[PDB]
Amino acid sequence: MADVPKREVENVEFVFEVMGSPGEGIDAVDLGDALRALNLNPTLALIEKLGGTKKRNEKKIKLDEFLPIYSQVKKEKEQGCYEDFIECLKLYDKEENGTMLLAELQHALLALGESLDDEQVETLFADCMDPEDDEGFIPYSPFLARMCDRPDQL
Amino acid sequence: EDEDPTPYLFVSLEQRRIDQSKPYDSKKSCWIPDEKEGYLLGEIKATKGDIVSVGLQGGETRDLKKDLLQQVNPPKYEKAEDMSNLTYLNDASVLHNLRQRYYNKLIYTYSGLFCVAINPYKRYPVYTNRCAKMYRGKRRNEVPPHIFAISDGAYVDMLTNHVNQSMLITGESGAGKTENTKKVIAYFATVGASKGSLEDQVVQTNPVLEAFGNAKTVRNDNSSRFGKFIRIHFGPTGKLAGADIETYLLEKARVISQQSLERSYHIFYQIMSGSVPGVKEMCFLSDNIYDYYNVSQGKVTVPNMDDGEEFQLADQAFDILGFTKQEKEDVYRITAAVMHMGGMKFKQRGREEQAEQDGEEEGGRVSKLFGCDTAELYKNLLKPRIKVGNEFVTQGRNVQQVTNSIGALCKGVFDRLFKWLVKKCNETLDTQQKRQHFIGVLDIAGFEIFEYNGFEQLCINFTNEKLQQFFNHIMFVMEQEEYKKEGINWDFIDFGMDLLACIDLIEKPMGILSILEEESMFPKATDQTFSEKLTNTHLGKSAPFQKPKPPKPGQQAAHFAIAHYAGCVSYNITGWLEKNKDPLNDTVVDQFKKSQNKLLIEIFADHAGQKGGGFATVSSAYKEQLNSLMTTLRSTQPHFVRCIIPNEMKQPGVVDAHLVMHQLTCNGVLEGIRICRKGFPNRMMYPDFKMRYMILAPAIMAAEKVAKNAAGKCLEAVGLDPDMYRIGHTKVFFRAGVLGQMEEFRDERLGKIMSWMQAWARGYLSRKGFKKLQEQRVA
Numbered sequence A: 001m002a003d004v005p006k007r008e009v010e011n012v013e014f015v016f017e018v019m020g021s022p023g024e025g026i027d028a029v030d031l032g033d034a035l036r037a038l039n040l041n042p043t044l045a046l047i048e049k050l051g052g053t054k055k056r057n058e059k060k061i062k063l064d065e066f067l068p069i070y071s072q073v074k075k076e077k078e079q080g081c082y083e084d085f086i087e088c089l090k091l092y093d094k095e096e097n098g099t100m101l102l103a104e105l106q107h108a109l110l111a112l113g114e115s116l117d118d119e120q121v122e123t124l125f126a127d128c129m130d131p132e133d134d135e136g137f138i139p140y141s142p143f144l145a146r147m148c149d150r151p152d153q154l
Numbered sequence B: 001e002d003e004d005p006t007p008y009l010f011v012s013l014e015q016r017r018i019d020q021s022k023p024y025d026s027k028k029s030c031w032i033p034d035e036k037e038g039y040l041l042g043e044i045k046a047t048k049g050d051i052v053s054v055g056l057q058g059g060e061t062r063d064l065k066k067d068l069l070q071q072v073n074p075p076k077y078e079k080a081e082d083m084s085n086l087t088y089l090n091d092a093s094v095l096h097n098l099r100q101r102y103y104n105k106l107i108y109t110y111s112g113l114f115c116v117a118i119n120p121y122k123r124y125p126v127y128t129n130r131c132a133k134m135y136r137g138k139r140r141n142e143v144p145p146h147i148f149a150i151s152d153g154a155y156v157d158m159l160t161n162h163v164n165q166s167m168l169i170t171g172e173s174g175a176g177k178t179e180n181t182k183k184v185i186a187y188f189a190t191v192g193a194s195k196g197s198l199e200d201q202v203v204q205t206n207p208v209l210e211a212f213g214n215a216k217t218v219r220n221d222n223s224s225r226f227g228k229f230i231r232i233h234f235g236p237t238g239k240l241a242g243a244d245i246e247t248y249l250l251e252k253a254r255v256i257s258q259q260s261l262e263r264s265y266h267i268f269y270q271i272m273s274g275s276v277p278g279v280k281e282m283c284f285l286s287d288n289i290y291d292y293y294n295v296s297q298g299k300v301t302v303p304n305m306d307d308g309e310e311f312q313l314a315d316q317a318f319d320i321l322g323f324t325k326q327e328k329e330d331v332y333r334i335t336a337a338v339m340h341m342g343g344m345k346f347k348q349r350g351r352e353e354q355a356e357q358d359g360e361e362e363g364g365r366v367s368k369l370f371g372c373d374t375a376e377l378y379k380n381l382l383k384p385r386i387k388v389g390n391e392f393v394t395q396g397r398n399v400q401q402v403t404n405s406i407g408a409l410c411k412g413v414f415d416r417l418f419k420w421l422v423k424k425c426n427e428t429l430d431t432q433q434k435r436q437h438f439i440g441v442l443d444i445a446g447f448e449i450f451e452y453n454g455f456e457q458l459c460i461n462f463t464n465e466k467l468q469q470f471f472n473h474i475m476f477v478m479e480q481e482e483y484k485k486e487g488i489n490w491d492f493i494d495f496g497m498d499l500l501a502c503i504d505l506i507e508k509p510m511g512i513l514s515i516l517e518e519e520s521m522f523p524k525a526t527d528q529t530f531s532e533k534l535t536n537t538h539l540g541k542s543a544p545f546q547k548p549k550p551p552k553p554g555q556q557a558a559h560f561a562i563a564h565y566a567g568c569v570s571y572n573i574t575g576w577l578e579k580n581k582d583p584l585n586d587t588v589v590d591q592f593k594k595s596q597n598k599l600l601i602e603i604f605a606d607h608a609g610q611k612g613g614g615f616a617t618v619s620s621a622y623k624e625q626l627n628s629l630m631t632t633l634r635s636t637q638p639h640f641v642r643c644i645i646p647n648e649m650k651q652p653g654v655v656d657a658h659l660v661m662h663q664l665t666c667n668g669v670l671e672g673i674r675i676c677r678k679g680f681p682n683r684m685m686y687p688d689f690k691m692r693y694m695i696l697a698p699a700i701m702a703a704e705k706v707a708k709n710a711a712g713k714c715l716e717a718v719g720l721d722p723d724m725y726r727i728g729h730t731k732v733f734f735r736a737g738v739l740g741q742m743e744e745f746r747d748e749r750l751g752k753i754m755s756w757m758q759a760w761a762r763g764y765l766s767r768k769g770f771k772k773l774q775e776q777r778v779a
């Protein structure tokens, strides 16, 4: 009631009412989607470390069991940000003009780190990415500002 | 030679773009040692413990210790004009930057406070009026490296700060000291020109002094056999006002002795060329150089050198410098007289094998040239006289005593003739007009290690021992200033004993030279007594004094060694006593002073007949010169130009890595770097810091308005003690290993952002579907 802010608990209430059932809760395969619905962006590896599970009906996480996980993910400060991603993509901005090759960006997202699906990247580019130029370059600053919900940088 | 100097001063834009694409990984790129190349660029393939596998161009791989690897500067610093801007200034990065520039036809490179000059062995149009105009008034950093930039800066500091300046141009034989020296002087003569002009008279001293003072050696077809210090005086308004020259340690023996591959002094062959009418006739000179043994013991010609064209130029210089016809002609007479004296043969007689002339042909030539009576001359040589108090003695002489007296006179006359030429040049260059300040230029042999190191090499290495102490001191002071300019307090003072230990071993009482002078006044003491008196007095007692390194096949043994600042040198003492005292037949000298050759009387006006005859020696005389010189230098603002020979073959564009590295150690280039980088091996300008390390604290740095605060807060953000760096006005300075830690932080951080970015992409995609699932959860 007076430990974790009240309004934030209410925010967790709303998400569970949408993704989980009163008796059980949210399925553990949905633990990442639940935290994301709360304006968080945890890595797949961190979700595994906090009760994430593959496939359905393997594990259930109820409310009071999810709150410590929420506060956990909300404590760790360096989980990425718009400014962090600008510096990563600057390493591809050969011309120092704020552009990179869409091929390199797509390749990196599908190959490196916690890689993404072909479908995840296509949807991402469809919404946030601007059209290429004649040479295949793209402005990566607005793409990150839309993905990171940073209107101030548009 | 009116051309465009740009392609010989700048790195082309085309070349820069190529350089910025060389293969660089801040994690793999490394320098490794190598015999022939000095250092090789490599690629760390794997690491196990303190051993790394380095991949070299060409497939080869080597396993060596991390200890031996040296950091690589990124390609943007390729052919850097000022190596103090390099992040890493290890030995490999210095060689690399210099050789790359050299391969690009760039002779000059700055290394912070001093300048490096690599012999091109090719004539580039960088000493024209068109090029000189490019450096007049401009600051050192506004134009590519060049000797003119230093000269102008010293001329500017002189006029602005009212302080005398110095330019020390050092290096081993054939490195390019004399060439650069002549260009500096010609630059000051130009800028200082108010409008037989003084400006041309100073330049015309070189053909004279080089004619009598330079000679062909294996290392250098125009080797300087003397040291030189010239002061260019400027009036209160900065106009040329005069000049004076001092010379040191002219190699007398070359007048009568040459090695097989070497020449005597150019003048002897210039005069024999016959390119000047009347000269050979007046001098009774034949047309066979080999008629004169004193000069034809080795080579008698030099490829690509026209002794005839050189004699005309030299003879012309005498005119411009104001030599009267009688003066000029007596110089040639005395010069040829030295040649003739080597032909005066003799033979034994009987009692005491007392010698007598065997042919007066050459003797007559000598007498006529020196304006002496031939009969009296031979009489004073064979039957000299001494004073016991108020009587004469008819002392005899055998063939060998007579032979040696001739060679001594040859050396004494030429040496005294050379000194007079310098004296005469100083008279011409003294215009009695107001001298306010001066810029002094030093052109002297640097520290060098030969197979045979004798008396001369000891004086030279002794001289450079004092120049290095002066250099080290100035580097501390100026670098402290350089830090002050960056708003940083920097203090490093240490004066290790060794900076003065060698100087003491050589100069202090009972030192090397003291014993050489003490032993010069003993009966015989030929070499061996000097040798043992050096060992018994210093070996095991004076730290730098060491046992001589045993000789290798084909080398004569040495007698002692010194651990010099630039390496261990083994010295051979045979002949030092003879070289240290140059006694002349006082009876023949008296005849000279009474001769009909007016110049001969002048060059000997110093020497008494029957100063003149005191306790002075070569070593004693030179120690006063060096003291006078060092006193003058320490009164000025100095500028150091380190000349370097690229290879042993006079080949333009060819770099002998081992040879260059040795010089970087001996010429004080690496030492100066240790000083300027003491306490902070690495530095970095803020634009480069941001490009490389803003990823560590982007938001933090993004807020700061000035680069300084951005770099600082970034270093505070990571776990760095504030003493591990200094925030200058335009540069960050790092202690050892800090960049390593910064690169580790960057590596780990860079290994996460990709997952963060993907986690955020999933968040966006998730929150996208939560909107649909949300609205679908109503009714």
Ligand SMILES: Nc1ncnc2c1ncn2[C@@H]1O[C@H](COP(=O)(O)OP(=O)(O)O)[C@@H](O)[C@H]1O
Binding pocket: B119, B120, B121, B122, B123, B124, B171, B172, B173, B174, B175, B176, B177, B178, B179, B180, B220, B221, B222, B223, B224, B643
């Ligand atoms: N800047 C230069 N331009 C052209 N040739 C040079 C230059 N510096 C040196 N050389 C060549 O190398 C030789 C040696 O130069 P020098 O100054 O006499 O050496 P050092 O005086 O150091 O013994 C010269 O005779 C010349 O041919």
Ligand SMILES: [Mg+2]
Binding pocket: B177, B178, B222, B223, B224
């Ligand atoms: Mg020289």
